[PDB]
Design a protein around this ligand. Structure first.
Ligand SMILES: *P(=O)(O)OCC(C)(C)[C@@H](O)C(=O)NCCC(=O)NCCSCCO
Length: 509
């Protein structure tokens, strides 16, 4: 996606357009060939990989050209193929065995529908959705060897759909309903609740998935498929879609077969693991941050959410600054957080974790599942560099780390073998992420729909900064270490670093 977004930068800058999308065709937007010499030339200076007009012909779209610049394609297995637990799923199942997460790993998705949907038709749509995505009806029961996936049959996957009347503010009820625990060995990792009442106009459709079966990118497939299925089941027929290109097990199986054994030196896993053992060498145990309380001895996993609204001219300024320096918006937001901690006394070694989506294959681009590997983006701020300088360091660190994004985070932790503490997250405690909410989801289920935020009562790490476009900043802080007022000031201080950065990126940090 980093390669993907940076290619759009050159397409729009060379073709002088604003019609640059992930699925846009270079030649289709008026693209010739000297234009490719300029586009191919610029791509070399930023990404540093060998690109040529030859690549542009084969991959004339940013999405394709990005995948071309960088492993077998996901091959759909047999109809009777058994489920296969991906290394991503193993971590999520494992985390809930070692921690009292309080549902901190339940990802919520709430939509406001102008019409109180038909709970019976909705249920049929939820049953259809679960049947389409095997990941939504796959249980993880513990055994003597390890966790074993149990793919429920469509007839046997008891879906959980129910209506819920709102008494108080639905915002706090959504958080409460979302944080309810999941029993991955007996319950499917999908929960649907239709919140209705006299205080809410129409109803609020809440989809609560456990992260083991869905990530933030699965929101679009879920809503799109639940709309497609809901509309059909409302007409007495089964929803008419074309079969899924692949299932999660197919992606996991193809991914695991290619990853190889960490003991074989020629396998991608060990060869990537080796990069990280060097890249994360002599890593800080933890950053010297300003906390309001000492690190507890138990991970309460409880936290809050401090938001900082971003003016359109500031969102527009950040995008402009990114394009000028040949860096993604994430890299800008990441440098801001790094500077913030650096200015707060963290030091010159700012290890920030970040989620990278493994959705390169076209067979899993719009599929439901968890493809987010956590990566340690180690930013060095020594030598009192300017912001534009740190944008160079960040980009190099990111692109270099993005080429080794397939080593499971848990394996990197085992390879770097860091001093551990159940109250502290390994390698990193501050996470920076850039999310985008689904667009064109305003007329779902034949009504007036609109996404609703769920107030987070939990926190996965000490500090999680999130740049969320519809844009704003969301601070997921650990309640055991930070006070809400302190988080509000910290997210606001991030905004001020961004304001100064765009205005004068030549200023020391
Ligand atoms: P611009 O759009 O005007 O430039 C177009 C170029 C020069 C890139 C190219 O499309 C062109 O004009 N001709 C390319 C045809 C060609 O000769 N390809 C070589 C492969 S043919 C087999 C050789 O063994």
């Amino acid at each position: 996606t980093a390669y993907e977004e940076i290619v759009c930068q050159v397409f729009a800058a060379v073709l002088d357009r604003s019609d640059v999308t992930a699925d846009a065709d270079f030649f289709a937007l008026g693209g010739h060939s000297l234009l490719s010499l300029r586009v191919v030339a610029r791509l070399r200076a930023l990404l540093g990989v060998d690109v040529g007009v030859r690549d542009l012909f084969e991959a004339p779209t940013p999405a394709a050209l990005a995948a071309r610049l960088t492993r077998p394609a996901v091959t759909r297995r047999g109809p009777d193929a058994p489920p296969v637990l991906s290394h991503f799923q193993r971590r999520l199942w494992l985390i809930e065995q070692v921690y009292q997460t309080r549902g901190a790993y339940n990802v919520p998705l709430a939509v406001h529908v102008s019409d109180r949907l038909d709970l019976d038709v909705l249920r049929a749509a939820v049953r259809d959705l679960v049947a389409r995505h095997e990941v939504l009806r796959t249980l993880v029961r513990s055994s003597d060897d390890g966790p074993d996936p149990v793919l429920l049959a469509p007839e046997d996957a008891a879906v959980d759909v129910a209506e819920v009347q709102a008494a108080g503010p639905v915002a706090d009820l959504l958080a409460e309903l979302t944080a309810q625990p999941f029993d991955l060995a007996t319950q499917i990792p999908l929960r649907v609740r239709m919140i209705t009442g006299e205080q809410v106009d129409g109803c609020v459709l809440l989809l609560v998935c456990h992260h083991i079966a869905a990530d933030e990118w699965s929101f679009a497939p879920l809503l799109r498929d639940l709309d497609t299925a809901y509309r059909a089941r409302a007409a007495g027929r089964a929803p008419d879609w074309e079969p899924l290109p692949a299932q999660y097990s197919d992606y996991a199986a193809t991914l695991h077969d290619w990853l190889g054994e960490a003991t074989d030196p020629a396998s991608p896993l060990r060869r990537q693991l080796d990069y990280w053992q060097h890249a994360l060498q002599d890593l800080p145990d933890e950053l010297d941050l300003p906390t309001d309380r000492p690190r507890p001895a138990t991970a309460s996993h409880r936290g809050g959410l401090a938001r900082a609204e971003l003016p359109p001219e500031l969102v527009e300024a950040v995008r402009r600054l990114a394009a000028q320096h040949g860096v993604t918006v994430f890299m800008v937001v990441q440098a801001a957080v790094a500077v913030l901690l650096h200015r707060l006394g963290a030091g010159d070694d700012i290890p920030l974790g970040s989620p990278v989506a493994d959705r390169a294959d076209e067979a899993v681009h719009d599929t439901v599942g968890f493809f987010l590997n956590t990566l340690v983006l180690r930013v060095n701020l020594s030598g009192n560099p300017t912001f534009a300088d740190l944008l160079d360091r960040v980009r190099a660190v990111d692109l270099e780390a993005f080429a080794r994004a397939d080593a499971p985070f848990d394996a990197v932790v085992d390879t770097v073998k860091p001093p551990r503490a159940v109250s502290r997250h390994p390698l990193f405690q501050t996470m920076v992420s850039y999310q985008r909410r689904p667009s064109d989801v305003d007329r779902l289920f034949g009504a007036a729909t609109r996404l609703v935020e769920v107030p987070l009562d939990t926190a996965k790490f000490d500090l999680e900064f999130a740049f969320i476009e519809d844009a704003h900043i969301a601070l997921n802080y650990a309640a055991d270490l930070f006070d809400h007022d302190s988080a509000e000031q910290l997210v606001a201080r991030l905004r001020t670093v961004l304001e100064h950065a765009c205005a004068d990126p030549c200023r020391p940090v």
